[PDB]
């Protein structure tokens, strides 16, 4: 109940509630999207 978060399109589901905010270049995000288009994943190991 508490950890249930919905979507705009009605798809409500419980899942990742552990996210942080790091400082990155936006070109990194574009490169991540492009690599995901290639089927490649990049895991970013947040320190704390």
């Amino acid at each position: 109940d508490s950890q249930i978060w919905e979507d705009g399109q009605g798809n409500k589901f419980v899942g990742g509630n552990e996210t942080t905010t790091v400082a990155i270049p936006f070109v990194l995000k574009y490169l991540d999207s492009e690599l995901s288009a290639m089927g490649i994943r990049l895991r970013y190991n947040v320190e704390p």
Binding site: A23, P25, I40
Partner: protein, 63 residues
């Protein structure tokens, strides 16, 4: 050619033949700890050379 034996693959793929070094780095599941300056600027982290060679700590007067 001489660059292939290197811990960081961000440096090589920024150098040239980006596709090849990317496939090699994804087949081996390579994990580079963001050491080379090229990787630092790709991920937007403070460089290691120069004034980034150390860290600054603050001596607070209360435990």
């Amino acid at each position: 050619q001489g660059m292939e034996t290197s811990t960081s693959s961000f440096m090589k793929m920024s150098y040239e033949t980006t596709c090849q070094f990317l496939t090699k780095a994804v087949l081996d599941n390579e994990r580079e700890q963001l050491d080379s300056p090229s990787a630092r600027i790709v991920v937007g982290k403070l460089n290691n050379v120069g004034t980034g060679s150390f860290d600054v700590l603050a001596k607070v007067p209360n435990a």
